[PDB]
Amino acid sequence: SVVTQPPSASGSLGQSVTISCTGTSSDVGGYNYVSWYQQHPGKAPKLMIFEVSKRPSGVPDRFSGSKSGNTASLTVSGLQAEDEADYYCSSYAGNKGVFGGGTKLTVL
Amino acid sequence: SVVTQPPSASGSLGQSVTISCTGTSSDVGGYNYVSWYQQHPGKAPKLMIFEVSKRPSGVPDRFSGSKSGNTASLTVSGLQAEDEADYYCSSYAGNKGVFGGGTKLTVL
Amino acid sequence: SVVTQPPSASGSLGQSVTISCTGTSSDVGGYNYVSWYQQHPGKAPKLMIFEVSKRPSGVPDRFSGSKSGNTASLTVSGLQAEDEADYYCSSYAGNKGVFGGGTKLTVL
Amino acid sequence: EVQLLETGGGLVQPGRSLRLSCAASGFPFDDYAIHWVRLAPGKGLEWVSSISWDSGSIGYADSVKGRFTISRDNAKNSLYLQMNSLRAEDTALYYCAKGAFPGYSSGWYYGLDVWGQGATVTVSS
Amino acid sequence: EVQLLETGGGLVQSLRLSCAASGFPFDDYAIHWVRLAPGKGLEWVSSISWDSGSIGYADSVKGRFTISRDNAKNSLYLQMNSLRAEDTALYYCAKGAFPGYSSGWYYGLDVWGQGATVTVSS
Amino acid sequence: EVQLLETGGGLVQPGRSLRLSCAASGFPFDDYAIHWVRLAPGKGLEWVSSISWDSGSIGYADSVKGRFTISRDNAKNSLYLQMNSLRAEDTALYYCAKGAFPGYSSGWYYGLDVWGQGATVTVSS
Amino acid sequence: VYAWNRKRISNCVADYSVLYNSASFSTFKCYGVSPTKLNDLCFTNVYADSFVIRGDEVRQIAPGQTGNIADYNYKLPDDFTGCVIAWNSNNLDSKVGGNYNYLYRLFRKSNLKPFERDISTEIYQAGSTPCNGVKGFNCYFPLQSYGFQ
């Protein structure tokens, strides 16, 4: 299927930016298994959020996850220079997974 | 199966030569779908006759096809230098095709 | 299955050495179809004994076969320099065959 | 223009495998059935295999039946021939040829009008 | 350390990809393929359980790709036949946080390889 | 003279495939059953597979059952062994051997009198 | 064994009880019928197949068996319904110098069908060249002697 994601996001240094991730009732709104990934240029993706709002070890508290209906959101408070990257959301869909389109985050 | 063809044929410049192509009642004598192909050395075959006696566009009137029982014939009148080549006949055989042995044509 | 064979055997020049070949009641002890093979280094195996104790043409009388229960034996009397090689036993097992582990024979 | 180009030839020992490819262009590969024909040295043409536009109809010669495997990828406009357990008599010049009309047996009905340059296959020890 | 390395990339007008694994028990974990198309985002390709008992493909490559593995060689494979222009992407080898099949979707894909480039053009 | 020659050896990764061939001459290949026997480095001989004169009787070892596929072409006097999904323990020297008498189990009854030179097969990553 | 004798028994009362208690049998195995039930059964015909073999070959006389005797001399069907009795005959079929009268078939192109008797003595062609009734290399006499002592 398709998980809708805005192509670009922006926020100033120290500010906050929310990146939405919109699916359907069979993926994003059907389970609490939404993941978020960060990808710097030329490097492999990095797991930032799993199970909608859980953070792995090594992810700062600035990244936080939430979900509401068919829309999952990733909020990055206290934006920093190293946060500029691409962000994809993932969701379970019944023995299959699906990624979002991706959002380029520019720290202005 | 096997479609019998004489190994070599010959004819003088401006004369005529007939190349026979003998099959059985399940191929040459079972359908009106006999084809003839010309192959110059080092080059891909060229379709000269289809449906026993039909000529594609680009084939001179000097080449003509006929069939009689299990034997199909290719006649080349007004033989020319460029006609020296190998000639194979083809026939339908029921969801399968079969070629003749081939005949080398020498223009004497 | 597995046919037990001692890894190494030894005997002095002119002496005798017996190489045992132990199976079960479904192979070595179930039929009288035990074979013995000699393999010199870098060369294909050579049939030395068939049917427990029969010698093909070209095998000297120094090699002799015997069987007792689940244990077949190959005795090489008057040991010679050319007898140094690897020896494998074979046995029928019901539409299938099985070889022994093999024994390196050193002529001391 | 219409064009077919065979790739994947070479020498390979008796019993080994080899895969041939045929790249197509200049015509709608989506709809036409394509065929393999080989030319053995000293012998003549010999039909190898055939496959319809959707792979719903597949045929092999008795000499390669259960030996070769024909297939195609309409998105890549490519035809394939997987040759396993090759024999000395498989040494030939393999041609990729399309029919005059997109039907399976239509290449036998109206002839094979377009041929590739061929790829050489040698099977010797 | 945990490590995955993809090999077998290049330009092609079939193609087989390999993923060498080390640093973790490859015998028990399910592994997945994810590609990154130029201009687009990530897209899941295929998945295979520890014993190959569970196998899944995306609809865009279903009946087209063939995933497999060799636990003795700690290697994952992806046989791509009949490649299309839209198959041009950067293919990643990724393991899940827990050895279950869908567990990589449950808890995320924590380890990724460097990827192998695949170009499909005439 | 009687003669058997195996071809198709080489190195291949664990999980891949490889096909072996055995060319026969000097005796009536039409009537005899032929067998495959391998020699693993450090281990001894190990029977692989067997096939009767008309392929009516076929047997495999439990270690390669459902893994190898034996076949023959009596017209080409050739025996084949299709090895798929190869493992490290498949690394061995594969022999082509005929029996003393043309029967299937006769090679076990009276021994395997003729052996080929063998073809090396390595299965490592 | 290659020329195993057969006797057809019909229109008579069979005495199985006395038959099985007359001599001492070293092997007595029945398939598809018990020895004691034959006293109550009637049959269209009975066949008594008699021959001599090696002791180690006695195991080959049974359903689903394979070997030289089973394949080329005397074959029983897998669904054989009947009895096999065997007893040592060393005091009868053995000579000081060796009893070579008893023979068995060694070479044969194909296995025998059940209850099939082959008495052919044609030279066996083990190679491509024809033998033309001359035994030599790749041309072997099909029969071999036991030579009991």
Side-chain angles (χ1 to χ4, degrees), chain G residues 36-76:
Chain G
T36 62
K37 301 293 183 179
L38 296 168
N39 300 338
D40 313 70
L41 302 179
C42 296
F43 310 99
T44 301
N45 297 312
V46 183
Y47 295 112
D49 304 330
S50 60
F51 52 87
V52 165
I53 53 175
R54 260 210 304 164
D56 299 329
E57 297 174 345
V58 175
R59 64 194 65 182
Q60 299 188 28
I61 312 303
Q65 296 299 324
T66 56
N68 60 327
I69 301 302
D71 297 0
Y72 306 149
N73 297 263
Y74 184 86
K75 179 60 174 180
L76 293 177

mmCIF file of all heavy atoms in Angstrom, chain G residues 36-76:
data_model
loop_
_atom_site.group_PDB
_atom_site.id
_atom_site.type_symbol
_atom_site.label_atom_id
_atom_site.label_comp_id
_atom_site.label_asym_id
_atom_site.label_seq_id
_atom_site.Cartn_x
_atom_site.Cartn_y
_atom_site.Cartn_z
ATOM 1 N N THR G 36 -0.681 -75.117 9.916
ATOM 2 C CA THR G 36 -1.727 -75.941 10.503
ATOM 3 C C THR G 36 -3.095 -75.720 9.872
ATOM 4 O O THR G 36 -3.965 -76.588 10.002
ATOM 5 C CB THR G 36 -1.821 -75.675 12.008
ATOM 6 O OG1 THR G 36 -2.172 -74.304 12.232
ATOM 7 C CG2 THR G 36 -0.489 -75.970 12.686
ATOM 8 N N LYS G 37 -3.310 -74.592 9.198
ATOM 9 C CA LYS G 37 -4.593 -74.310 8.569
ATOM 10 C C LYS G 37 -4.755 -74.991 7.218
ATOM 11 O O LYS G 37 -5.885 -75.111 6.733
ATOM 12 C CB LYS G 37 -4.773 -72.797 8.391
ATOM 13 C CG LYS G 37 -4.707 -72.003 9.689
ATOM 14 C CD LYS G 37 -5.886 -72.308 10.596
ATOM 15 C CE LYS G 37 -5.840 -71.462 11.858
ATOM 16 N NZ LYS G 37 -6.995 -71.725 12.759
ATOM 17 N N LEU G 38 -3.663 -75.458 6.609
ATOM 18 C CA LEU G 38 -3.762 -76.103 5.305
ATOM 19 C C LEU G 38 -4.624 -77.355 5.366
ATOM 20 O O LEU G 38 -5.181 -77.773 4.344
ATOM 21 C CB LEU G 38 -2.366 -76.442 4.785
ATOM 22 C CG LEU G 38 -1.470 -75.235 4.504
ATOM 23 C CD1 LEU G 38 -0.033 -75.670 4.278
ATOM 24 C CD2 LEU G 38 -1.987 -74.455 3.305
ATOM 25 N N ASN G 39 -4.747 -77.966 6.544
ATOM 26 C CA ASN G 39 -5.601 -79.138 6.686
ATOM 27 C C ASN G 39 -7.067 -78.816 6.428
ATOM 28 O O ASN G 39 -7.839 -79.728 6.110
ATOM 29 C CB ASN G 39 -5.442 -79.741 8.081
ATOM 30 C CG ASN G 39 -4.019 -80.175 8.368
ATOM 31 O OD1 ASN G 39 -3.235 -80.419 7.450
ATOM 32 N ND2 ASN G 39 -3.677 -80.279 9.648
ATOM 33 N N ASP G 40 -7.465 -77.551 6.556
ATOM 34 C CA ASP G 40 -8.856 -77.160 6.362
ATOM 35 C C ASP G 40 -9.100 -76.469 5.029
ATOM 36 O O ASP G 40 -10.263 -76.215 4.686
ATOM 37 C CB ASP G 40 -9.300 -76.229 7.493
ATOM 38 C CG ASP G 40 -8.912 -76.753 8.862
ATOM 39 O OD1 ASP G 40 -7.702 -76.757 9.175
ATOM 40 O OD2 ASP G 40 -9.813 -77.160 9.624
ATOM 41 N N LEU G 41 -8.052 -76.165 4.271
ATOM 42 C CA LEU G 41 -8.185 -75.403 3.041
ATOM 43 C C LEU G 41 -8.192 -76.320 1.826
ATOM 44 O O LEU G 41 -7.538 -77.366 1.804
ATOM 45 C CB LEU G 41 -7.044 -74.391 2.910
ATOM 46 C CG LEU G 41 -6.898 -73.383 4.050
ATOM 47 C CD1 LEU G 41 -5.714 -72.464 3.791
ATOM 48 C CD2 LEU G 41 -8.176 -72.579 4.233
ATOM 49 N N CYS G 42 -8.949 -75.912 0.810
ATOM 50 C CA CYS G 42 -8.962 -76.567 -0.488
ATOM 51 C C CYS G 42 -8.447 -75.599 -1.540
ATOM 52 O O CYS G 42 -8.671 -74.389 -1.452
ATOM 53 C CB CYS G 42 -10.371 -77.039 -0.866
ATOM 54 S SG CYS G 42 -11.086 -78.304 0.212
ATOM 55 N N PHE G 43 -7.755 -76.139 -2.540
ATOM 56 C CA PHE G 43 -7.150 -75.322 -3.581
ATOM 57 C C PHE G 43 -7.357 -75.980 -4.936
ATOM 58 O O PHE G 43 -7.494 -77.202 -5.039
ATOM 59 C CB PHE G 43 -5.653 -75.115 -3.328
ATOM 60 C CG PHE G 43 -5.335 -74.648 -1.936
ATOM 61 C CD1 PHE G 43 -4.916 -75.546 -0.970
ATOM 62 C CD2 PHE G 43 -5.456 -73.312 -1.595
ATOM 63 C CE1 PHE G 43 -4.623 -75.120 0.314
ATOM 64 C CE2 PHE G 43 -5.166 -72.880 -0.316
ATOM 65 C CZ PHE G 43 -4.746 -73.785 0.640
ATOM 66 N N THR G 44 -7.380 -75.150 -5.982
ATOM 67 C CA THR G 44 -7.519 -75.676 -7.335
ATOM 68 C C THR G 44 -6.346 -76.580 -7.691
ATOM 69 O O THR G 44 -6.530 -77.671 -8.241
ATOM 70 C CB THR G 44 -7.638 -74.524 -8.338
ATOM 71 O OG1 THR G 44 -8.769 -73.711 -8.003
ATOM 72 C CG2 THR G 44 -7.809 -75.060 -9.752
ATOM 73 N N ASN G 45 -5.128 -76.143 -7.371
ATOM 74 C CA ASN G 45 -3.933 -76.925 -7.652
ATOM 75 C C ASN G 45 -2.874 -76.615 -6.605
ATOM 76 O O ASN G 45 -2.946 -75.606 -5.900
ATOM 77 C CB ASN G 45 -3.377 -76.634 -9.052
ATOM 78 C CG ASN G 45 -4.335 -77.029 -10.157
ATOM 79 O OD1 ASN G 45 -4.880 -78.133 -10.157
ATOM 80 N ND2 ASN G 45 -4.551 -76.125 -11.103
ATOM 81 N N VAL G 46 -1.880 -77.492 -6.515
ATOM 82 C CA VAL G 46 -0.711 -77.264 -5.680
ATOM 83 C C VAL G 46 0.526 -77.460 -6.542
ATOM 84 O O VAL G 46 0.529 -78.290 -7.458
ATOM 85 C CB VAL G 46 -0.689 -78.202 -4.454
ATOM 86 C CG1 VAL G 46 0.510 -77.893 -3.566
ATOM 87 C CG2 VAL G 46 -1.985 -78.077 -3.668
ATOM 88 N N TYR G 47 1.560 -76.677 -6.273
ATOM 89 C CA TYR G 47 2.823 -76.772 -6.993
ATOM 90 C C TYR G 47 3.948 -77.021 -6.002
ATOM 91 O O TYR G 47 4.121 -76.255 -5.048
ATOM 92 C CB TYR G 47 3.094 -75.499 -7.797
ATOM 93 C CG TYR G 47 2.097 -75.256 -8.904
ATOM 94 C CD1 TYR G 47 1.210 -74.188 -8.847
ATOM 95 C CD2 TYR G 47 2.043 -76.093 -10.011
ATOM 96 C CE1 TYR G 47 0.298 -73.963 -9.859
ATOM 97 C CE2 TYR G 47 1.133 -75.876 -11.027
ATOM 98 C CZ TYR G 47 0.265 -74.810 -10.947
ATOM 99 O OH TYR G 47 -0.641 -74.591 -11.958
ATOM 100 N N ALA G 48 4.708 -78.086 -6.232
ATOM 101 C CA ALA G 48 5.860 -78.432 -5.402
ATOM 102 C C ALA G 48 7.106 -78.177 -6.243
ATOM 103 O O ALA G 48 7.386 -78.920 -7.188
ATOM 104 C CB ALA G 48 5.788 -79.878 -4.927
ATOM 105 N N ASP G 49 7.832 -77.110 -5.918
ATOM 106 C CA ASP G 49 9.054 -76.748 -6.618
ATOM 107 C C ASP G 49 10.250 -77.194 -5.791
ATOM 108 O O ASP G 49 10.437 -76.727 -4.663
ATOM 109 C CB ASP G 49 9.111 -75.242 -6.869
ATOM 110 C CG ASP G 49 7.906 -74.736 -7.635
ATOM 111 O OD1 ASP G 49 7.339 -75.511 -8.432
ATOM 112 O OD2 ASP G 49 7.526 -73.561 -7.439
ATOM 113 N N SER G 50 11.067 -78.074 -6.358
ATOM 114 C CA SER G 50 12.181 -78.678 -5.643
ATOM 115 C C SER G 50 13.484 -78.322 -6.336
ATOM 116 O O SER G 50 13.562 -78.321 -7.571
ATOM 117 C CB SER G 50 12.032 -80.204 -5.563
ATOM 118 O OG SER G 50 11.987 -80.775 -6.860
ATOM 119 N N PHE G 51 14.501 -78.011 -5.536
ATOM 120 C CA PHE G 51 15.825 -77.705 -6.073
ATOM 121 C C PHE G 51 16.837 -77.760 -4.932
ATOM 122 O O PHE G 51 16.501 -78.101 -3.794
ATOM 123 C CB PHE G 51 15.839 -76.349 -6.780
ATOM 124 C CG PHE G 51 15.295 -75.224 -5.947
ATOM 125 C CD1 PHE G 51 16.119 -74.522 -5.087
ATOM 126 C CD2 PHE G 51 13.959 -74.866 -6.033
ATOM 127 C CE1 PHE G 51 15.622 -73.483 -4.322
ATOM 128 C CE2 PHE G 51 13.458 -73.829 -5.270
ATOM 129 C CZ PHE G 51 14.289 -73.138 -4.415
ATOM 130 N N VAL G 52 18.086 -77.434 -5.258
ATOM 131 C CA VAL G 52 19.190 -77.423 -4.300
ATOM 132 C C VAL G 52 19.956 -76.120 -4.470
ATOM 133 O O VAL G 52 20.200 -75.680 -5.600
ATOM 134 C CB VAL G 52 20.131 -78.628 -4.495
ATOM 135 C CG1 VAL G 52 21.442 -78.408 -3.748
ATOM 136 C CG2 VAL G 52 19.462 -79.899 -4.021
ATOM 137 N N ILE G 53 20.331 -75.501 -3.352
ATOM 138 C CA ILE G 53 21.057 -74.235 -3.351
ATOM 139 C C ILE G 53 22.102 -74.261 -2.242
ATOM 140 O O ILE G 53 22.286 -75.264 -1.548
ATOM 141 C CB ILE G 53 20.114 -73.024 -3.186
ATOM 142 C CG1 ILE G 53 19.224 -73.205 -1.955
ATOM 143 C CG2 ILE G 53 19.276 -72.836 -4.439
ATOM 144 C CD1 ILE G 53 18.359 -72.003 -1.644
ATOM 145 N N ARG G 54 22.818 -73.147 -2.101
ATOM 146 C CA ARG G 54 23.710 -72.963 -0.969
ATOM 147 C C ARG G 54 22.910 -72.636 0.288
ATOM 148 O O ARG G 54 21.766 -72.175 0.227
ATOM 149 C CB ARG G 54 24.713 -71.842 -1.240
ATOM 150 C CG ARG G 54 26.092 -72.307 -1.676
ATOM 151 C CD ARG G 54 27.153 -71.314 -1.233
ATOM 152 N NE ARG G 54 26.889 -69.966 -1.719
ATOM 153 C CZ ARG G 54 27.467 -68.873 -1.241
ATOM 154 N NH1 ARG G 54 28.336 -68.925 -0.247
ATOM 155 N NH2 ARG G 54 27.157 -67.692 -1.772
ATOM 156 N N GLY G 55 23.528 -72.883 1.444
ATOM 157 C CA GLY G 55 22.886 -72.521 2.696
ATOM 158 C C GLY G 55 22.669 -71.025 2.817
ATOM 159 O O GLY G 55 21.570 -70.565 3.142
ATOM 160 N N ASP G 56 23.710 -70.240 2.526
ATOM 161 C CA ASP G 56 23.601 -68.789 2.603
ATOM 162 C C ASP G 56 22.599 -68.226 1.608
ATOM 163 O O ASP G 56 22.114 -67.108 1.809
ATOM 164 C CB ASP G 56 24.973 -68.149 2.367
ATOM 165 C CG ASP G 56 25.998 -68.567 3.405
ATOM 166 O OD1 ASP G 56 25.606 -68.833 4.559
ATOM 167 O OD2 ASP G 56 27.197 -68.625 3.063
ATOM 168 N N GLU G 57 22.273 -68.969 0.551
ATOM 169 C CA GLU G 57 21.273 -68.553 -0.419
ATOM 170 C C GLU G 57 19.860 -68.937 -0.007
ATOM 171 O O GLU G 57 18.901 -68.513 -0.662
ATOM 172 C CB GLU G 57 21.589 -69.157 -1.790
ATOM 173 C CG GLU G 57 22.915 -68.700 -2.380
ATOM 174 C CD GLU G 57 23.259 -69.423 -3.666
ATOM 175 O OE1 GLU G 57 22.624 -70.458 -3.957
ATOM 176 O OE2 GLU G 57 24.165 -68.955 -4.386
ATOM 177 N N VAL G 58 19.703 -69.719 1.065
ATOM 178 C CA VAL G 58 18.367 -70.108 1.504
ATOM 179 C C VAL G 58 17.539 -68.881 1.852
ATOM 180 O O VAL G 58 16.320 -68.868 1.651
ATOM 181 C CB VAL G 58 18.458 -71.083 2.694
ATOM 182 C CG1 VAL G 58 17.071 -71.406 3.227
ATOM 183 C CG2 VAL G 58 19.186 -72.357 2.287
ATOM 184 N N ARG G 59 18.183 -67.835 2.370
ATOM 185 C CA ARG G 59 17.464 -66.610 2.703
ATOM 186 C C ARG G 59 16.846 -65.955 1.478
ATOM 187 O O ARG G 59 15.874 -65.201 1.617
ATOM 188 C CB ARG G 59 18.408 -65.628 3.395
ATOM 189 C CG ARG G 59 19.549 -65.146 2.514
ATOM 190 C CD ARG G 59 20.629 -64.459 3.330
ATOM 191 N NE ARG G 59 21.280 -65.379 4.255
ATOM 192 C CZ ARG G 59 22.236 -65.039 5.109
ATOM 193 N NH1 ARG G 59 22.681 -63.794 5.188
ATOM 194 N NH2 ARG G 59 22.754 -65.967 5.907
ATOM 195 N N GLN G 60 17.381 -66.215 0.282
ATOM 196 C CA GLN G 60 16.844 -65.615 -0.931
ATOM 197 C C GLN G 60 15.516 -66.228 -1.359
ATOM 198 O O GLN G 60 14.834 -65.649 -2.212
ATOM 199 C CB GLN G 60 17.852 -65.743 -2.075
ATOM 200 C CG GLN G 60 19.180 -65.051 -1.812
ATOM 201 C CD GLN G 60 20.080 -65.033 -3.031
ATOM 202 O OE1 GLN G 60 19.605 -65.054 -4.167
ATOM 203 N NE2 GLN G 60 21.388 -64.997 -2.802
ATOM 204 N N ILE G 61 15.135 -67.373 -0.799
ATOM 205 C CA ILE G 61 13.871 -68.013 -1.138
ATOM 206 C C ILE G 61 12.786 -67.482 -0.208
ATOM 207 O O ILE G 61 12.478 -68.100 0.818
ATOM 208 C CB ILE G 61 13.971 -69.547 -1.048
ATOM 209 C CG1 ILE G 61 15.219 -70.050 -1.781
ATOM 210 C CG2 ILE G 61 12.720 -70.195 -1.619
ATOM 211 C CD1 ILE G 61 15.297 -69.641 -3.240
ATOM 212 N N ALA G 62 12.201 -66.343 -0.563
ATOM 213 C CA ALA G 62 11.141 -65.736 0.228
ATOM 214 C C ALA G 62 10.601 -64.538 -0.539
ATOM 215 O O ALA G 62 11.265 -64.034 -1.454
ATOM 216 C CB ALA G 62 11.654 -65.306 1.614
ATOM 217 N N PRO G 63 9.404 -64.063 -0.199
ATOM 218 C CA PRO G 63 8.840 -62.913 -0.917
ATOM 219 C C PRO G 63 9.721 -61.681 -0.776
ATOM 220 O O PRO G 63 10.314 -61.432 0.277
ATOM 221 C CB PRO G 63 7.475 -62.707 -0.247
ATOM 222 C CG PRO G 63 7.172 -63.998 0.441
ATOM 223 C CD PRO G 63 8.492 -64.562 0.848
ATOM 224 N N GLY G 64 9.803 -60.906 -1.855
ATOM 225 C CA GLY G 64 10.518 -59.646 -1.813
ATOM 226 C C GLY G 64 12.013 -59.763 -1.636
ATOM 227 O O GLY G 64 12.645 -58.818 -1.161
ATOM 228 N N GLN G 65 12.599 -60.897 -2.004
ATOM 229 C CA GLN G 65 14.030 -61.116 -1.870
ATOM 230 C C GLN G 65 14.734 -60.877 -3.200
ATOM 231 O O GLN G 65 14.149 -61.010 -4.275
ATOM 232 C CB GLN G 65 14.317 -62.536 -1.372
ATOM 233 C CG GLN G 65 13.790 -62.818 0.023
ATOM 234 C CD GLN G 65 14.409 -61.919 1.075
ATOM 235 O OE1 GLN G 65 15.589 -61.575 0.996
ATOM 236 N NE2 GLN G 65 13.612 -61.523 2.062
ATOM 237 N N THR G 66 16.013 -60.520 -3.106
ATOM 238 C CA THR G 66 16.834 -60.252 -4.275
ATOM 239 C C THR G 66 18.188 -60.921 -4.099
ATOM 240 O O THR G 66 18.622 -61.215 -2.983
ATOM 241 C CB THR G 66 17.018 -58.745 -4.511
ATOM 242 O OG1 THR G 66 17.563 -58.136 -3.335
ATOM 243 C CG2 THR G 66 15.691 -58.091 -4.854
ATOM 244 N N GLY G 67 18.851 -61.162 -5.226
ATOM 245 C CA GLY G 67 20.128 -61.852 -5.232
ATOM 246 C C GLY G 67 20.277 -62.727 -6.459
ATOM 247 O O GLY G 67 19.383 -62.766 -7.305
ATOM 248 N N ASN G 68 21.401 -63.439 -6.566
ATOM 249 C CA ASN G 68 21.616 -64.274 -7.741
ATOM 250 C C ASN G 68 20.536 -65.339 -7.878
ATOM 251 O O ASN G 68 19.953 -65.496 -8.957
ATOM 252 C CB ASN G 68 22.998 -64.926 -7.677
ATOM 253 C CG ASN G 68 23.176 -65.796 -6.449
ATOM 254 O OD1 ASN G 68 22.623 -65.513 -5.388
ATOM 255 N ND2 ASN G 68 23.948 -66.867 -6.591
ATOM 256 N N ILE G 69 20.236 -66.059 -6.797
ATOM 257 C CA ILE G 69 19.209 -67.094 -6.856
ATOM 258 C C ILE G 69 17.838 -66.476 -7.083
ATOM 259 O O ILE G 69 17.055 -66.953 -7.913
ATOM 260 C CB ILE G 69 19.237 -67.947 -5.571
ATOM 261 C CG1 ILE G 69 20.606 -68.613 -5.397
ATOM 262 C CG2 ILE G 69 18.126 -68.987 -5.598
ATOM 263 C CD1 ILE G 69 21.021 -69.502 -6.554
ATOM 264 N N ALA G 70 17.525 -65.405 -6.351
ATOM 265 C CA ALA G 70 16.224 -64.765 -6.499
ATOM 266 C C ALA G 70 16.049 -64.148 -7.880
ATOM 267 O O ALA G 70 14.948 -64.192 -8.441
ATOM 268 C CB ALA G 70 16.041 -63.698 -5.419
ATOM 269 N N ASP G 71 17.112 -63.571 -8.445
ATOM 270 C CA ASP G 71 16.972 -62.807 -9.679
ATOM 271 C C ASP G 71 17.076 -63.687 -10.920
ATOM 272 O O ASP G 71 16.320 -63.492 -11.879
ATOM 273 C CB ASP G 71 18.029 -61.704 -9.728
ATOM 274 C CG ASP G 71 17.863 -60.690 -8.615
ATOM 275 O OD1 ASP G 71 16.926 -60.841 -7.803
ATOM 276 O OD2 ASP G 71 18.672 -59.741 -8.549
ATOM 277 N N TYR G 72 17.999 -64.653 -10.932
ATOM 278 C CA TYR G 72 18.343 -65.362 -12.156
ATOM 279 C C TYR G 72 18.054 -66.854 -12.116
ATOM 280 O O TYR G 72 18.161 -67.512 -13.157
ATOM 281 C CB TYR G 72 19.830 -65.155 -12.476
ATOM 282 C CG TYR G 72 20.255 -63.705 -12.538
ATOM 283 C CD1 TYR G 72 21.538 -63.327 -12.176
ATOM 284 C CD2 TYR G 72 19.373 -62.716 -12.958
ATOM 285 C CE1 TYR G 72 21.935 -62.005 -12.231
ATOM 286 C CE2 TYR G 72 19.760 -61.393 -13.014
ATOM 287 C CZ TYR G 72 21.042 -61.043 -12.651
ATOM 288 O OH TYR G 72 21.430 -59.724 -12.704
ATOM 289 N N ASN G 73 17.699 -67.415 -10.958
ATOM 290 C CA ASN G 73 17.480 -68.853 -10.865
ATOM 291 C C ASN G 73 16.039 -69.186 -10.495
ATOM 292 O O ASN G 73 15.382 -69.974 -11.184
ATOM 293 C CB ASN G 73 18.437 -69.467 -9.845
ATOM 294 C CG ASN G 73 19.891 -69.313 -10.247
ATOM 295 O OD1 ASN G 73 20.490 -70.226 -10.816
ATOM 296 N ND2 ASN G 73 20.468 -68.152 -9.959
ATOM 297 N N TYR G 74 15.536 -68.594 -9.414
ATOM 298 C CA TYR G 74 14.191 -68.894 -8.930
ATOM 299 C C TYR G 74 13.664 -67.682 -8.181
ATOM 300 O O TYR G 74 14.285 -67.237 -7.214
ATOM 301 C CB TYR G 74 14.203 -70.130 -8.027
ATOM 302 C CG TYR G 74 12.833 -70.571 -7.566
ATOM 303 C CD1 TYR G 74 12.052 -71.413 -8.351
ATOM 304 C CD2 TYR G 74 12.321 -70.151 -6.347
ATOM 305 C CE1 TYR G 74 10.800 -71.819 -7.933
ATOM 306 C CE2 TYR G 74 11.068 -70.555 -5.921
ATOM 307 C CZ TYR G 74 10.313 -71.388 -6.717
ATOM 308 O OH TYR G 74 9.066 -71.793 -6.297
ATOM 309 N N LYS G 75 12.522 -67.160 -8.622
ATOM 310 C CA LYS G 75 11.948 -65.941 -8.070
ATOM 311 C C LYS G 75 10.559 -66.232 -7.526
ATOM 312 O O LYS G 75 9.765 -66.916 -8.177
ATOM 313 C CB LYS G 75 11.877 -64.837 -9.133
ATOM 314 C CG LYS G 75 11.258 -63.531 -8.653
ATOM 315 C CD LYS G 75 12.028 -62.934 -7.487
ATOM 316 C CE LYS G 75 11.486 -61.564 -7.107
ATOM 317 N NZ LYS G 75 12.227 -60.968 -5.962
ATOM 318 N N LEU G 76 10.274 -65.715 -6.329
ATOM 319 C CA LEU G 76 8.945 -65.824 -5.743
ATOM 320 C C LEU G 76 8.222 -64.485 -5.813
ATOM 321 O O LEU G 76 8.861 -63.430 -5.712
ATOM 322 C CB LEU G 76 9.029 -66.273 -4.283
ATOM 323 C CG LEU G 76 9.525 -67.697 -4.025
ATOM 324 C CD1 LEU G 76 9.624 -67.960 -2.529
ATOM 325 C CD2 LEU G 76 8.612 -68.717 -4.687
#
